[PDB]
Design a protein around this nucleic acid. Structure first.
Ligand SMILES: NCCC[C@H](N)CC(=O)N[C@@H]1[C@H](O)[C@@H](OC(N)=O)[C@@H](CO)O[C@H]1NC1=N[C@@H]2C(=O)NC[C@@H](O)[C@H]2N1
Lengths: 60, 44, 78
RNA sequence: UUCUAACUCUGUCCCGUGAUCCGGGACGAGGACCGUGUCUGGUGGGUAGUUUGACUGGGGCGGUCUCCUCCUAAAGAGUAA
RNA sequence: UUUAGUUGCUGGGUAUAGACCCGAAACCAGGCGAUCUAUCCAUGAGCAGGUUGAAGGUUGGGUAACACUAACUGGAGGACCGAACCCACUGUCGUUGAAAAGCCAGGGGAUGACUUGUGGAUAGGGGUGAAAGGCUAAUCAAGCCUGGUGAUAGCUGGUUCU
RNA sequence: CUCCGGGGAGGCGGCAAAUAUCCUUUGAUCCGGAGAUGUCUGAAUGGGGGAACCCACCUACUUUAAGGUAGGUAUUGCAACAUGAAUACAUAGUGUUGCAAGGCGAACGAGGGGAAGUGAAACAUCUCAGUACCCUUAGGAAAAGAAAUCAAUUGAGAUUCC
Protein backbone atom coordinates (compact mmCIF):
# COMPACT_ATOMS: atom_id res chain seq x y z
CA UNK A 1 0.00 0.00 0.00
CA UNK A 2 1.11 3.54 -0.75
CA UNK A 3 0.58 5.73 2.32
CA UNK A 4 1.51 9.17 3.60
CA UNK A 5 2.37 9.50 7.27
CA UNK A 6 0.71 11.68 9.90
CA UNK A 7 3.65 11.37 12.32
CA UNK A 8 7.29 10.22 12.51
CA UNK A 9 8.44 6.61 12.03
CA UNK A 10 11.98 5.54 12.84
CA UNK A 11 12.82 3.87 9.51
CA UNK A 12 10.04 4.93 7.12
CA UNK A 13 10.44 8.70 7.29
CA UNK A 14 8.43 11.47 8.89
CA UNK A 15 5.70 14.04 8.53
CA UNK A 16 4.05 13.69 5.13
CA UNK A 17 6.41 11.42 3.20
CA UNK A 18 4.99 9.00 0.62
CA UNK A 19 6.57 5.54 0.89
CA UNK A 20 5.65 2.03 -0.26
CA UNK A 21 4.42 -0.14 2.61
CA UNK A 22 3.37 -3.78 2.69
CA UNK A 23 -0.40 -4.14 2.76
CA UNK A 24 -0.48 -5.83 6.17
CA UNK A 25 1.59 -3.13 7.87
CA UNK A 26 -0.75 -0.39 6.69
CA UNK A 27 -4.02 -2.28 7.05
CA UNK A 28 -3.53 -3.70 10.54
CA UNK A 29 -1.25 -1.21 12.31
CA UNK A 30 -0.85 2.22 10.71
CA UNK A 31 -4.38 3.14 9.54
CA UNK A 32 -6.35 1.93 12.59
CA UNK A 33 -3.94 3.73 14.92
CA UNK A 34 -3.86 6.97 12.91
CA UNK A 35 -0.13 7.11 12.11
CA UNK A 36 -0.72 7.30 8.33
CA UNK A 37 -3.40 7.15 5.64
CA UNK A 38 -3.57 5.79 2.10
CA UNK A 39 -2.27 7.94 -0.75
CA UNK A 40 -5.48 8.46 -2.66
CA UNK A 41 -5.45 11.66 -4.69
CA UNK A 42 -8.26 13.10 -2.56
CA UNK A 43 -6.43 12.20 0.67
CA UNK A 44 -3.20 13.77 -0.58
CA UNK A 45 -4.97 16.94 -1.70
CA UNK A 46 -6.80 17.27 1.62
CA UNK A 47 -3.61 16.66 3.62
CA UNK A 48 -1.56 19.14 1.60
CA UNK A 49 -4.07 21.96 1.11
CA UNK A 50 -5.07 22.80 4.68
CA UNK A 51 -3.84 20.44 7.38
CA UNK A 52 -0.13 20.34 6.51
CA UNK A 53 0.58 23.26 8.84
CA UNK A 54 -1.86 21.87 11.42
CA UNK A 55 0.04 18.57 11.54
CA UNK A 56 3.45 20.28 11.50
CA UNK A 57 2.35 22.35 14.51
CA UNK A 58 2.02 19.27 16.76
CA UNK A 59 5.64 18.41 17.49
CA UNK A 60 4.74 15.74 20.06
CA UNK B 1 -48.68 -65.73 18.75
CA UNK B 2 -48.03 -61.99 18.88
CA UNK B 3 -48.76 -60.31 15.55
CA UNK B 4 -47.42 -57.11 14.04
CA UNK B 5 -50.31 -54.73 14.78
CA UNK B 6 -50.64 -53.73 18.45
CA UNK B 7 -52.92 -50.68 18.34
CA UNK B 8 -52.36 -47.53 20.38
CA UNK B 9 -54.28 -44.40 19.44
CA UNK B 10 -51.82 -41.92 20.96
CA UNK B 11 -48.91 -43.41 19.00
CA UNK B 12 -51.07 -43.56 15.87
CA UNK B 13 -51.94 -39.87 16.10
CA UNK B 14 -48.40 -38.77 16.96
CA UNK B 15 -46.80 -40.69 14.09
CA UNK B 16 -49.36 -40.37 11.28
CA UNK B 17 -51.50 -37.43 12.43
CA UNK B 18 -52.53 -34.18 10.78
CA UNK B 19 -50.14 -31.98 12.76
CA UNK B 20 -47.31 -34.47 12.22
CA UNK B 21 -47.88 -34.22 8.46
CA UNK B 22 -48.08 -30.42 8.65
CA UNK B 23 -44.79 -30.23 10.57
CA UNK B 24 -42.55 -31.05 7.56
CA UNK B 25 -42.33 -30.25 3.86
CA UNK B 26 -42.69 -33.88 2.77
CA UNK B 27 -45.80 -34.29 4.91
CA UNK B 28 -47.34 -31.22 3.32
CA UNK B 29 -46.55 -32.75 -0.08
CA UNK B 30 -48.31 -35.95 1.03
CA UNK B 31 -51.39 -33.94 2.00
CA UNK B 32 -51.27 -32.09 -1.33
CA UNK B 33 -51.13 -35.37 -3.27
CA UNK B 34 -54.06 -36.80 -1.31
CA UNK B 35 -56.14 -33.66 -1.85
CA UNK B 36 -55.37 -33.77 -5.58
CA UNK B 37 -56.42 -37.42 -5.75
CA UNK B 38 -59.60 -36.57 -3.86
CA UNK B 39 -59.41 -38.84 -0.81
CA UNK B 40 -62.40 -38.57 1.52
CA UNK B 41 -60.13 -38.88 4.59
CA UNK B 42 -56.76 -37.13 4.50
CA UNK B 43 -55.14 -38.71 7.57
CA UNK B 44 -55.69 -41.45 10.13
CA UNK C 1 -25.49 -18.43 7.36
CA UNK C 2 -23.67 -19.21 4.09
CA UNK C 3 -20.25 -19.12 2.40
CA UNK C 4 -20.99 -15.79 0.72
CA UNK C 5 -18.65 -12.80 0.53
CA UNK C 6 -20.25 -9.63 1.87
CA UNK C 7 -18.23 -7.29 -0.37
CA UNK C 8 -18.26 -9.04 -3.76
CA UNK C 9 -20.99 -11.67 -3.50
CA UNK C 10 -18.75 -14.62 -4.36
CA UNK C 11 -19.97 -18.10 -3.45
CA UNK C 12 -19.09 -21.74 -4.21
CA UNK C 13 -19.50 -22.92 -7.80
CA UNK C 14 -19.56 -26.42 -9.28
CA UNK C 15 -17.16 -28.14 -11.64
CA UNK C 16 -15.44 -31.40 -12.53
CA UNK C 17 -12.43 -33.37 -11.47
CA UNK C 18 -10.76 -34.67 -14.63
CA UNK C 19 -8.37 -37.61 -14.38
CA UNK C 20 -5.65 -38.76 -16.77
CA UNK C 21 -8.04 -41.32 -18.25
CA UNK C 22 -10.61 -38.50 -18.60
CA UNK C 23 -13.04 -39.72 -15.93
CA UNK C 24 -15.25 -36.87 -14.74
CA UNK C 25 -16.64 -36.47 -11.21
CA UNK C 26 -18.47 -33.53 -9.68
CA UNK C 27 -16.72 -31.08 -7.35
CA UNK C 28 -17.05 -27.50 -6.19
CA UNK C 29 -14.67 -24.55 -6.00
CA UNK C 30 -14.86 -22.56 -2.82
CA UNK C 31 -14.05 -18.87 -2.26
CA UNK C 32 -11.16 -17.79 -0.06
CA UNK C 33 -13.51 -16.61 2.68
CA UNK C 34 -12.75 -15.59 6.26
CA UNK C 35 -13.56 -13.11 9.02
CA UNK C 36 -11.74 -9.83 9.56
CA UNK C 37 -12.14 -6.84 11.87
CA UNK C 38 -11.84 -3.34 10.42
CA UNK C 39 -11.52 -0.15 12.43
CA UNK C 40 -14.19 2.40 11.46
CA UNK C 41 -13.39 5.94 12.57
CA UNK C 42 -16.75 7.54 11.74
CA UNK C 43 -18.44 5.34 14.35
CA UNK C 44 -15.41 4.73 16.61
CA UNK C 45 -15.73 0.96 16.48
CA UNK C 46 -14.64 -2.34 14.99
CA UNK C 47 -16.79 -3.91 12.28
CA UNK C 48 -16.34 -7.63 11.59
CA UNK C 49 -16.94 -8.81 8.02
CA UNK C 50 -16.86 -12.21 6.32
CA UNK C 51 -15.11 -11.58 3.02
CA UNK C 52 -12.48 -12.72 0.54
CA UNK C 53 -8.95 -11.56 -0.15
CA UNK C 54 -10.33 -9.88 -3.27
CA UNK C 55 -12.70 -8.10 -0.90
CA UNK C 56 -9.67 -6.82 1.00
CA UNK C 57 -8.06 -5.67 -2.23
CA UNK C 58 -11.22 -3.72 -3.06
CA UNK C 59 -11.29 -2.24 0.46
CA UNK C 60 -7.63 -1.24 0.17
CA UNK C 61 -8.26 0.48 -3.16
CA UNK C 62 -11.52 2.27 -2.28
CA UNK C 63 -11.51 2.90 1.48
CA UNK C 64 -13.54 1.30 4.25
CA UNK C 65 -16.13 4.07 4.55
CA UNK C 66 -17.15 3.93 0.88
CA UNK C 67 -17.50 0.14 0.98
CA UNK C 68 -19.52 0.23 4.21
CA UNK C 69 -21.80 2.90 2.74
CA UNK C 70 -22.32 0.77 -0.37
CA UNK C 71 -23.22 -2.29 1.72
CA UNK C 72 -25.64 -0.26 3.84
CA UNK C 73 -27.26 1.13 0.69
CA UNK C 74 -27.56 -2.45 -0.60
CA UNK C 75 -29.34 -3.27 2.65
CA UNK C 76 -26.94 -5.09 4.98
CA UNK C 77 -26.50 -4.65 8.73
CA UNK C 78 -22.91 -3.43 8.98
C1' U D 1 16.68 -13.99 18.36
C1' U D 2 12.88 -10.55 19.80
C1' C D 3 8.12 -7.91 19.39
C1' U D 4 2.48 -7.13 18.60
C1' A D 5 -1.08 -5.13 15.72
C1' A D 6 -3.63 -9.58 11.92
C1' C D 7 -5.44 -14.38 13.77
C1' U D 8 -6.64 -18.59 18.03
C1' C D 9 -8.55 -19.91 23.04
C1' U D 10 -14.07 -26.18 24.36
C1' G D 11 -9.24 -19.59 30.09
C1' U D 12 -11.05 -15.35 34.07
C1' C D 13 -14.30 -10.94 34.91
C1' C D 14 -18.44 -7.26 33.24
C1' C D 15 -22.99 -5.98 30.28
C1' G D 16 -27.32 -7.41 27.06
C1' U D 17 -29.83 -10.80 31.19
C1' G D 18 -33.90 -13.81 35.09
C1' A D 19 -29.23 -17.45 30.25
C1' U D 20 -22.64 -23.17 30.88
C1' C D 21 -25.84 -20.58 23.51
C1' C D 22 -24.42 -16.01 21.29
C1' G D 23 -22.58 -10.89 20.73
C1' G D 24 -19.90 -6.51 22.68
C1' G D 25 -16.07 -4.79 26.37
C1' A D 26 -11.63 -5.57 29.89
C1' C D 27 -7.69 -8.94 31.05
C1' G D 28 -4.45 -13.32 30.49
C1' A D 29 -1.92 -17.11 27.62
C1' G D 30 -0.27 -17.84 22.57
C1' G D 31 1.21 -15.54 17.62
C1' A D 32 2.92 -14.36 12.12
C1' C D 33 3.11 -20.12 13.77
C1' C D 34 -1.57 -23.04 13.83
C1' G D 35 -5.57 -23.13 10.46
C1' U D 36 -8.53 -22.25 5.78
C1' G D 37 -8.95 -21.28 -0.18
C1' U D 38 -6.53 -22.39 -5.12
C1' C D 39 -2.69 -25.38 -7.35
C1' U D 40 0.53 -29.72 -6.77
C1' G D 41 3.48 -34.73 -5.56
C1' G D 42 2.50 -39.16 -2.36
C1' U D 43 -0.71 -42.81 -0.01
C1' G D 44 -5.27 -44.70 -0.63
C1' G D 45 -10.27 -52.36 -1.48
C1' G D 46 -12.35 -46.99 2.87
C1' U D 47 -15.73 -46.59 -1.26
C1' A D 48 -17.42 -46.92 -6.75
C1' G D 49 -17.80 -48.59 -11.85
C1' U D 50 -16.16 -52.64 -14.54
C1' U D 51 -13.06 -56.67 -16.95
C1' U D 52 -11.36 -61.67 -16.25
C1' G D 53 -11.30 -65.40 -24.90
C1' A D 54 -12.59 -69.42 -27.85
C1' C D 55 -12.06 -74.70 -29.62
C1' U D 56 -13.30 -79.13 -26.70
C1' G D 57 -16.84 -86.83 -28.07
C1' G D 58 -20.16 -82.46 -21.07
C1' G D 59 -17.22 -78.71 -18.33
C1' G D 60 -12.56 -78.08 -15.76
C1' C D 61 -6.92 -79.34 -15.97
C1' G D 62 -3.62 -80.26 -20.33
C1' G D 63 -2.86 -78.85 -25.51
C1' U D 64 -3.96 -75.54 -29.60
C1' C D 65 -5.09 -70.39 -32.29
C1' U D 66 -0.90 -67.09 -38.11
C1' C D 67 2.39 -69.04 -42.39
C1' C D 68 5.26 -73.31 -45.44
C1' U D 69 6.07 -79.04 -47.14
C1' C D 70 4.17 -84.40 -47.45
C1' C D 71 0.05 -88.09 -46.59
C1' U D 72 -5.13 -88.86 -45.67
C1' A D 73 -7.39 -86.77 -50.84
C1' A D 74 -10.91 -91.69 -54.22
C1' A D 75 -4.91 -90.31 -61.61
C1' G D 76 -8.07 -81.93 -63.10
C1' A D 77 -9.11 -78.04 -58.79
C1' G D 78 -10.99 -78.28 -53.77
C1' U D 79 -12.04 -81.50 -49.48
C1' A D 80 -12.74 -82.77 -42.21
C1' A D 81 -11.17 -84.76 -37.29
C1' U E 1 -18.42 -39.35 -73.83
C1' U E 2 -24.99 -44.10 -71.72
C1' U E 3 -28.72 -39.63 -74.72
C1' A E 4 -35.86 -38.83 -69.89
C1' G E 5 -36.82 -36.89 -66.08
C1' U E 6 -39.95 -34.86 -62.27
C1' U E 7 -44.27 -34.11 -58.96
C1' G E 8 -48.52 -36.56 -56.77
C1' C E 9 -51.34 -41.39 -55.30
C1' U E 10 -50.88 -46.78 -53.99
C1' G E 11 -47.70 -50.83 -52.71
C1' G E 12 -42.66 -53.87 -51.22
C1' G E 13 -37.92 -52.93 -48.33
C1' U E 14 -34.68 -49.95 -45.08
C1' A E 15 -33.47 -46.11 -41.04
C1' U E 16 -34.87 -43.10 -36.27
C1' A E 17 -38.33 -43.62 -32.77
C1' G E 18 -41.23 -48.91 -27.53
C1' A E 19 -41.52 -50.31 -33.66
C1' C E 20 -45.14 -57.58 -33.95
C1' C E 21 -47.16 -58.84 -28.61
C1' C E 22 -46.36 -60.65 -23.50
C1' G E 23 -41.95 -61.98 -19.82
C1' A E 24 -36.79 -60.85 -16.05
C1' A E 25 -33.00 -61.08 -12.13
C1' A E 26 -31.36 -55.79 -11.95
C1' C E 27 -29.64 -50.09 -11.81
C1' C E 28 -30.96 -44.79 -10.46
C1' A E 29 -34.00 -40.50 -7.98
C1' G E 30 -37.50 -38.81 -4.35
C1' G E 31 -40.54 -40.24 -0.30
C1' C E 32 -42.84 -43.91 3.85
C1' G E 33 -41.74 -47.15 8.03
C1' A E 34 -38.55 -49.12 15.16
C1' U E 35 -47.30 -50.24 17.00
C1' C E 36 -43.05 -56.79 14.84
C1' U E 37 -38.02 -57.26 15.88
C1' A E 38 -32.28 -55.54 17.51
C1' U E 39 -29.73 -52.19 21.01
C1' C E 40 -30.27 -47.95 24.19
C1' C E 41 -32.82 -43.82 27.49
C1' A E 42 -36.73 -42.21 31.39
C1' U E 43 -40.45 -43.81 34.71
C1' G E 44 -43.41 -47.89 37.06
C1' A E 45 -44.51 -53.23 38.22
C1' G E 46 -43.33 -58.86 39.28
C1' C E 47 -40.75 -63.19 41.30
C1' A E 48 -45.79 -69.32 46.09
C1' G E 49 -42.95 -72.42 49.20
C1' G E 50 -38.70 -75.07 51.09
C1' U E 51 -32.97 -75.90 51.78
C1' U E 52 -27.63 -74.74 52.44
C1' G E 53 -25.01 -71.89 55.86
C1' A E 54 -19.77 -67.30 53.71
C1' A E 55 -17.78 -62.83 56.01
C1' G E 56 -18.41 -60.54 60.62
C1' G E 57 -19.71 -60.72 66.17
C1' U E 58 -20.07 -62.71 71.52
C1' U E 59 -18.58 -66.19 75.18
C1' G E 60 -15.49 -70.04 76.99
C1' G E 61 -10.65 -72.69 76.46
C1' G E 62 -4.95 -71.76 75.30
C1' U E 63 -0.49 -68.63 75.45
C1' A E 64 4.78 -64.47 78.75
C1' A E 65 1.64 -62.01 74.85
C1' C E 66 0.33 -63.71 70.34
C1' A E 67 -1.09 -67.46 67.43
C1' C E 68 -4.59 -71.26 67.65
C1' U E 69 -9.44 -73.45 69.04
C1' A E 70 -14.95 -74.96 70.55
C1' A E 71 -20.01 -73.37 71.13
C1' C E 72 -23.66 -69.91 70.05
C1' U E 73 -25.24 -65.98 66.86
C1' G E 74 -25.33 -64.08 61.87
C1' G E 75 -27.66 -64.51 56.85
C1' A E 76 -23.61 -64.09 51.86
C1' G E 77 -24.27 -66.25 46.90
C1' G E 78 -24.45 -64.42 38.31
C1' A E 79 -25.75 -70.78 45.51
C1' C E 80 -29.54 -75.54 45.60
C1' C E 81 -34.95 -78.06 44.94
C1' G E 82 -39.36 -76.26 43.07
C1' A E 83 -45.06 -73.18 41.20
C1' A E 84 -46.27 -68.39 38.67
C1' C E 85 -43.36 -66.10 34.72
C1' C E 86 -39.53 -66.46 30.62
C1' C E 87 -37.59 -70.25 27.30
C1' A E 88 -37.39 -74.22 23.56
C1' C E 89 -33.54 -80.11 24.40
C1' U E 90 -36.35 -85.28 22.83
C1' G E 91 -40.58 -87.98 20.86
C1' U E 92 -45.64 -88.95 18.88
C1' C E 93 -49.49 -86.33 16.22
C1' G E 94 -50.66 -82.52 12.85
C1' U E 95 -48.75 -81.17 7.10
C1' U E 96 -55.80 -79.05 1.59
C1' G E 97 -53.71 -78.25 10.20
C1' A E 98 -57.80 -76.03 15.57
C1' A E 99 -52.73 -73.16 14.02
C1' A E 100 -48.89 -69.41 7.21
C1' A E 101 -44.58 -72.68 13.22
C1' G E 102 -49.18 -75.58 17.21
C1' C E 103 -51.05 -79.44 20.89
C1' C E 104 -49.73 -83.43 24.24
C1' A E 105 -45.97 -86.10 27.45
C1' G E 106 -41.34 -85.24 29.24
C1' G E 107 -37.23 -80.84 29.53
C1' G E 108 -34.07 -75.77 31.08
C1' G E 109 -33.67 -70.86 34.09
C1' A E 110 -36.40 -69.36 38.06
C1' U E 111 -32.54 -62.53 43.20
C1' G E 112 -30.47 -62.03 38.30
C1' A E 113 -25.45 -60.64 32.56
C1' C E 114 -33.64 -61.60 35.33
C1' U E 115 -38.78 -60.86 33.37
C1' U E 116 -42.28 -57.17 32.04
C1' G E 117 -46.01 -52.34 31.08
C1' U E 118 -46.17 -47.24 29.36
C1' G E 119 -43.52 -43.30 26.64
C1' G E 120 -39.19 -42.08 23.77
C1' A E 121 -34.03 -42.50 20.29
C1' U E 122 -31.25 -44.80 16.17
C1' A E 123 -33.59 -45.34 8.73
C1' G E 124 -31.54 -48.51 3.84
C1' G E 125 -24.76 -49.29 1.41
C1' G E 126 -27.83 -46.80 6.54
C1' G E 127 -29.37 -48.60 11.64
C1' U E 128 -28.71 -52.34 15.40
C1' G E 129 -26.13 -57.06 16.47
C1' A E 130 -22.81 -61.52 23.93
C1' A E 131 -21.76 -62.21 15.73
C1' A E 132 -26.27 -66.58 13.14
C1' G E 133 -25.20 -62.40 7.38
C1' G E 134 -29.04 -62.45 12.43
C1' C E 135 -33.13 -58.61 12.86
C1' U E 136 -35.14 -53.80 10.60
C1' A E 137 -44.19 -54.74 10.21
C1' A E 138 -45.68 -63.12 8.02
C1' U E 139 -40.52 -59.43 3.01
C1' C E 140 -33.40 -58.99 3.83
C1' A E 141 -25.84 -60.78 0.61
C1' A E 142 -28.94 -54.36 0.74
C1' G E 143 -36.78 -52.90 3.37
C1' C E 144 -41.36 -50.89 1.18
C1' C E 145 -43.94 -47.20 -2.26
C1' U E 146 -44.01 -44.04 -6.44
C1' G E 147 -41.45 -42.26 -10.60
C1' G E 148 -37.00 -42.94 -15.00
C1' U E 149 -40.33 -47.11 -17.47
C1' G E 150 -43.55 -49.59 -22.39
C1' A E 151 -35.41 -50.58 -18.83
C1' U E 152 -32.73 -54.28 -21.97
C1' A E 153 -33.28 -59.84 -23.39
C1' G E 154 -28.25 -62.68 -29.97
C1' C E 155 -33.49 -66.49 -25.08
C1' U E 156 -38.54 -69.20 -24.56
C1' G E 157 -43.79 -68.89 -25.95
C1' G E 158 -47.75 -66.93 -29.37
C1' U E 159 -49.25 -64.75 -33.95
C1' U E 160 -56.64 -64.98 -36.15
C1' C E 161 -60.46 -65.64 -43.55
C1' U E 162 -60.07 -68.32 -48.74
C1' C F 1 -83.68 -12.75 4.70
C1' U F 2 -83.97 -7.24 1.84
C1' C F 3 -84.24 -4.12 -2.60
C1' C F 4 -84.35 -3.58 -8.02
C1' G F 5 -85.61 -5.94 -12.93
C1' G F 6 -88.04 -10.04 -15.75
C1' G F 7 -92.51 -13.40 -15.91
C1' G F 8 -97.85 -14.55 -15.42
C1' A F 9 -100.40 -19.74 -12.75
C1' G F 10 -99.16 -22.70 -10.27
C1' G F 11 -95.86 -24.15 -6.00
C1' C F 12 -93.80 -26.34 -0.95
C1' G F 13 -85.02 -29.20 -3.94
C1' G F 14 -83.64 -35.04 -5.23
C1' C F 15 -83.54 -40.37 -3.93
C1' A F 16 -89.27 -40.70 -3.47
C1' A F 17 -94.56 -42.24 -3.83
C1' A F 18 -98.29 -41.14 -0.31
C1' U F 19 -99.84 -37.89 3.27
C1' A F 20 -100.78 -33.59 6.08
C1' U F 21 -100.60 -28.59 6.96
C1' C F 22 -100.38 -25.03 3.56
C1' C F 23 -98.52 -20.37 0.13
C1' U F 24 -100.21 -17.78 -4.22
C1' U F 25 -103.64 -12.82 -9.59
C1' U F 26 -103.04 -7.63 -2.76
C1' G F 27 -98.70 -11.48 -8.21
C1' A F 28 -96.23 -17.04 -5.31
C1' U F 29 -92.68 -20.90 -7.14
C1' C F 30 -88.85 -19.55 -10.89
C1' C F 31 -84.80 -16.43 -13.59
C1' G F 32 -80.78 -12.07 -13.41
C1' G F 33 -78.17 -8.02 -10.52
C1' A F 34 -76.88 -5.68 -5.93
C1' G F 35 -76.83 -6.12 -0.39
C1' A F 36 -77.50 -8.47 4.96
C1' U F 37 -76.12 -12.82 7.96
C1' G F 38 -72.17 -16.12 7.59
C1' U F 39 -70.63 -21.64 13.92
C1' C F 40 -65.80 -24.60 14.40
C1' U F 41 -60.85 -26.46 11.99
C1' G F 42 -57.44 -25.18 8.52
C1' A F 43 -51.42 -19.93 6.43
C1' A F 44 -54.65 -19.94 11.70
C1' U F 45 -52.10 -15.21 13.78
C1' G F 46 -53.89 -14.59 22.36
C1' G F 47 -50.94 -19.45 24.67
C1' G F 48 -51.05 -24.75 23.96
C1' G F 49 -52.55 -29.20 21.12
C1' G F 50 -53.39 -35.95 19.32
C1' A F 51 -57.28 -30.66 13.20
C1' A F 52 -62.50 -29.55 13.99
C1' C F 53 -60.30 -29.21 21.17
C1' C F 54 -58.16 -27.26 26.21
C1' C F 55 -56.71 -22.69 28.91
C1' A F 56 -56.27 -17.17 29.04
C1' C F 57 -55.57 -11.69 29.67
C1' C F 58 -56.98 -6.24 28.74
C1' U F 59 -60.73 -2.43 27.62
C1' A F 60 -66.01 -0.25 27.08
C1' C F 61 -71.03 -1.24 28.17
C1' U F 62 -74.28 -4.43 30.98
C1' U F 63 -75.54 -8.23 35.70
C1' U F 64 -75.83 -8.98 41.06
C1' A F 65 -73.58 -12.77 42.13
C1' A F 66 -69.96 -16.55 40.36
C1' G F 67 -71.89 -14.00 34.21
C1' G F 68 -73.14 -11.55 29.15
C1' U F 69 -72.05 -8.02 24.47
C1' A F 70 -68.40 -5.95 21.22
C1' G F 71 -63.35 -4.76 20.29
C1' G F 72 -58.21 -6.06 21.00
C1' U F 73 -53.90 -9.25 22.30
C1' A F 74 -48.89 -13.80 16.58
C1' U F 75 -44.10 -13.37 13.95
C1' U F 76 -40.82 -11.02 10.55
C1' G F 77 -39.31 -6.64 7.45
C1' C F 78 -39.63 -1.02 6.86
C1' A F 79 -40.69 3.95 8.95
C1' A F 80 -41.62 7.46 12.96
C1' C F 81 -41.37 8.11 18.11
C1' A F 82 -40.03 6.93 23.11
C1' U F 83 -36.73 4.53 26.30
C1' G F 84 -31.90 2.80 27.11
C1' A F 85 -25.96 -1.13 29.02
C1' A F 86 -20.76 -2.63 29.77
C1' U F 87 -18.76 3.23 29.01
C1' A F 88 -18.16 9.60 29.44
C1' C F 89 -20.58 11.05 24.69
C1' A F 90 -22.82 7.09 21.93
C1' U F 91 -24.14 2.38 19.98
C1' A F 92 -26.28 -2.47 21.09
C1' G F 93 -30.83 -3.74 23.41
C1' U F 94 -36.23 -2.72 24.67
C1' G F 95 -41.33 -0.91 23.74
C1' U F 96 -45.67 1.83 21.12
C1' U F 97 -47.90 3.20 16.66
C1' G F 98 -48.61 2.83 11.11
C1' C F 99 -47.76 -0.10 6.71
C1' A F 100 -46.55 -4.76 4.12
C1' A F 101 -45.58 -10.27 3.74
C1' G F 102 -46.56 -15.59 4.67
C1' G F 103 -50.84 -20.04 2.36
C1' C F 104 -53.28 -22.55 -2.01
C1' G F 105 -53.69 -23.76 -7.22
C1' A F 106 -53.44 -27.16 -14.09
C1' A F 107 -49.81 -26.20 -17.82
C1' C F 108 -46.39 -22.63 -19.84
C1' G F 109 -41.34 -18.96 -17.97
C1' A F 110 -36.68 -17.88 -15.46
C1' G F 111 -32.92 -19.44 -12.09
C1' G F 112 -29.98 -23.12 -8.28
C1' G F 113 -28.55 -28.62 -8.11
C1' G F 114 -28.62 -33.08 -11.29
C1' A F 115 -28.72 -39.54 -12.26
C1' A F 116 -29.06 -44.55 -14.07
C1' G F 117 -31.31 -48.46 -16.77
C1' U F 118 -29.83 -48.15 -22.16
C1' G F 119 -26.40 -47.87 -27.10
C1' A F 120 -21.41 -48.70 -28.33
C1' A F 121 -23.55 -56.07 -30.16
C1' A F 122 -18.14 -56.45 -23.74
C1' C F 123 -16.49 -51.51 -21.41
C1' A F 124 -13.80 -46.92 -18.69
C1' U F 125 -13.64 -41.73 -23.14
C1' C F 126 -18.44 -41.03 -25.39
C1' U F 127 -24.06 -41.84 -25.39
C1' C F 128 -28.58 -41.67 -22.75
C1' A F 129 -28.92 -35.92 -21.42
C1' G F 130 -28.75 -31.02 -19.06
C1' U F 131 -33.56 -35.75 -19.95
C1' A F 132 -36.17 -37.80 -15.12
C1' C F 133 -36.21 -35.77 -10.34
C1' C F 134 -35.50 -32.07 -6.07
C1' C F 135 -35.32 -26.55 -4.63
C1' U F 136 -36.50 -21.00 -5.27
C1' U F 137 -39.49 -17.54 -7.61
C1' A F 138 -42.81 -14.34 -11.57
C1' G F 139 -46.57 -13.01 -15.32
C1' G F 140 -50.75 -13.19 -18.44
C1' A F 141 -47.33 -14.40 -20.90
C1' A F 142 -42.12 -14.77 -19.43
C1' A F 143 -37.13 -14.33 -21.33
C1' A F 144 -34.32 -11.46 -25.10
C1' G F 145 -33.60 -6.78 -27.22
C1' A F 146 -31.44 -1.39 -30.11
C1' A F 147 -24.15 -3.94 -32.18
C1' A F 148 -17.20 -2.90 -28.43
C1' U F 149 -22.86 -7.52 -34.33
C1' C F 150 -22.10 -9.77 -38.98
C1' A F 151 -20.03 -9.58 -43.88
C1' A F 152 -15.86 -9.53 -47.29
C1' U F 153 -18.66 -6.84 -54.66
C1' U F 154 -17.01 -2.95 -49.15
C1' G F 155 -22.36 -4.55 -48.19
C1' A F 156 -26.30 -5.42 -44.10
C1' G F 157 -28.46 -2.96 -39.95
C1' A F 158 -32.24 -4.30 -32.37
C1' U F 159 -34.88 -8.86 -30.26
C1' U F 160 -38.23 -13.26 -31.06
C1' C F 161 -40.56 -17.29 -34.07
C1' C F 162 -41.33 -20.45 -38.94
N1 LIG G 1 -10.45 -37.20 -25.21
C1 LIG G 1 -9.96 -38.09 -24.16
C2 LIG G 1 -8.52 -38.51 -24.45
C3 LIG G 1 -7.98 -39.56 -23.46
C4 LIG G 1 -6.44 -39.65 -23.40
N2 LIG G 1 -5.90 -39.70 -24.76
C5 LIG G 1 -5.95 -40.89 -22.63
C6 LIG G 1 -4.44 -40.91 -22.47
O1 LIG G 1 -3.67 -41.06 -23.41
N3 LIG G 1 -4.06 -40.73 -21.16
C7 LIG G 1 -2.67 -40.69 -20.74
C8 LIG G 1 -2.38 -41.74 -19.65
O2 LIG G 1 -3.35 -41.62 -18.61
C9 LIG G 1 -0.98 -41.54 -19.04
O3 LIG G 1 0.00 -41.99 -19.97
C10 LIG G 1 -0.12 -43.29 -20.38
N4 LIG G 1 -0.07 -43.37 -21.75
O4 LIG G 1 -0.26 -44.26 -19.64
C11 LIG G 1 -0.71 -40.07 -18.70
C12 LIG G 1 0.72 -39.82 -18.24
O5 LIG G 1 0.94 -38.42 -18.20
O6 LIG G 1 -0.94 -39.25 -19.85
C13 LIG G 1 -2.31 -39.28 -20.25
N5 LIG G 1 -2.56 -38.33 -21.30
C14 LIG G 1 -2.89 -37.05 -21.05
N6 LIG G 1 -3.04 -36.50 -19.85
C15 LIG G 1 -3.37 -35.08 -20.19
C16 LIG G 1 -4.57 -34.39 -19.65
O7 LIG G 1 -5.30 -34.82 -18.76
N7 LIG G 1 -4.73 -33.17 -20.33
C17 LIG G 1 -3.86 -32.63 -21.41
C18 LIG G 1 -2.88 -33.62 -22.08
O8 LIG G 1 -1.58 -33.43 -21.52
C19 LIG G 1 -3.47 -34.95 -21.70
N8 LIG G 1 -3.09 -36.25 -22.16
Amino acid sequence: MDVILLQRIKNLGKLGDKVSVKAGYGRNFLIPQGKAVAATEANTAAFEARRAELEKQEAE
Amino acid sequence: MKRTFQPSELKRKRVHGFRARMATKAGRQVLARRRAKGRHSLTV
Amino acid sequence: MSKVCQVTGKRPVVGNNVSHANNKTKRRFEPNLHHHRFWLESEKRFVRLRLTTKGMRIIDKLGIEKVVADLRAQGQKI
